[PDB]
Amino acid sequence: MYIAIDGDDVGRKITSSYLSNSEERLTYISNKLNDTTKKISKMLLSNGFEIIFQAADGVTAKTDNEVNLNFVFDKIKSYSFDEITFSAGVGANLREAYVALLNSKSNGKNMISIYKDILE
Amino acid sequence: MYIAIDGDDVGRKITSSYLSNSEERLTYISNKLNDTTKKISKMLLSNGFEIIFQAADGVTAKTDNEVNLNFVFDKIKSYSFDEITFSAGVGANLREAYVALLNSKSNGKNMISIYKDILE
Numbered sequence: 001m002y003i004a005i006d007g008d009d010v011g012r013k014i015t016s017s018y019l020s021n022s023e024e025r026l027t028y029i030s031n032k033l034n035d036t037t038k039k040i041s042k043m044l045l046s047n048g049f050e051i052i053f054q055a056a057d058g059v060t061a062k063t064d065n066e067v068n069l070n071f072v073f074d075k076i077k078s079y080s081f082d083e084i085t086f087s088a089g090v091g092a093n094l095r096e097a098y099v100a101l102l103n104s105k106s107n108g109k110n111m112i113s114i115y116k117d118i119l120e
Numbered sequence: 121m122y123i124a125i126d127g128d129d130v131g132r133k134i135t136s137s138y139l140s141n142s143e144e145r146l147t148y149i150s151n152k153l154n155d156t157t158k159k160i161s162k163m164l165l166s167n168g169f170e171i172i173f174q175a176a177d178g179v180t181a182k183t184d185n186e187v188n189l190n191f192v193f194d195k196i197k198s199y200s201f202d203e204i205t206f207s208a209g210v211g212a213n214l215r216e217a218y219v220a221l222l223n224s225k226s227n228g229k230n231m232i233s234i235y236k237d238i239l240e
């Protein structure tokens with residue numbers, strides 16, 4: 001199973017910081033993204049996932065083991081901070097997790113989609 | 121002086137890797153971005169810059185010292201790899217470096233713009 005996780009509307013708070021000349025707020029959000037994907041990457045490892053990347057505001061991973069996915073996403077939901085949520089997609093391969101990720105980014109965000117469910 | 125540096129068309133090679141189920145190529149480009157912004161952040165420190173963020177595929181920094189900017193950008197240009205260039209903007213504040221950055225992303229990419237020059 002592949003899972004892609006990625007920050008919602010992250011650009012808006014970064015751009016807001018440039019335009020208001022707020023470098024400290026810009027630096028805080030950059031390291032906060034850095035640290036939250038770190039939290040996400042570690043929760044995933046503890047549940048038998050192999051991280052593919054944990055960089056920028058995203059994390060992609062895969063698990064040849066079994067996994068409670070309402071648990072996993074309920075904890076991704078819980079690293080939200082200051083109006084920045086995370087969306088997730090899941091599929092049987094990287095491409096499918098990607099599409100399902102677009103689906104979430106495309107349907108309210110702060111949500112998870114599963115590729116097999118979209119097709120049906 | 122503020123400088124914002126950011127990777128061109130980085131999403132296209134990442135997305136290409138999802139859609140072709142090429143996780144190894146996806147992981148390589150993620151760490152390669154990680155490592156190139158590292159190279160950029162270090163060259164800037166050696167020339168008297170203070171890094172504001174070095175994350176994702178970008179680096180923003182400022183220098184209360186003086187700086188040869190054709191040198192600096194000529195070396196940013198030289199960390200290009202596999203058809204991924206970097207654009208830069210410069211200004212007297214964060215907002216201005218941002219606009220000048222959009223200008224470069226907006227005018228061929230693999231290029232630098234200076235905010236004061238745009239206004240004139």
Ligand SMILES: Nc1ncnc2c1ncn2[C@@H]1O[C@H](COP(=O)(O)NP(=O)(O)OP(=O)(O)O)[C@@H](O)[C@H]1O
Pocket residue numbers: 006007008009010011012014029030031033034055056057058105173175176177178
């Ligand atoms: N850790 C980070 N440090 C600095 N900039 C980041 C970081 N993570 C993401 N970004 C920036 O945030 C943006 C991520 O690109 P996205 O295209 O993913 N857009 P975003 O608004 O963040 O949300 P979605 O549309 O995906 O829901 C780019 O501008 C990245 O350079």
Ligand SMILES: Nc1ncnc2c1ncn2[C@@H]1O[C@H](COP(=O)(O)NP(=O)(O)OP(=O)(O)O)[C@@H](O)[C@H]1O
Pocket residue numbers: 053055056057058126127128129130131132134149150151153154175176177178225
């Ligand atoms: N180090 C990284 N690791 C993983 N994904 C990254 C990294 N740096 C950037 N990205 C992704 O690349 C994109 C950066 O957002 P951008 O909105 O900056 N778009 P890009 O096509 O990269 O070029 P420009 O339009 O800015 O010229 C987002 O999808 C990021 O999540």
Ligand SMILES: [Mg+2]
Pocket residue numbers: 006007008009010011057
């Ligand atoms: Mg995002």
Ligand SMILES: [Mg+2]
Pocket residue numbers: 126127128129130131177
């Ligand atoms: Mg970019």
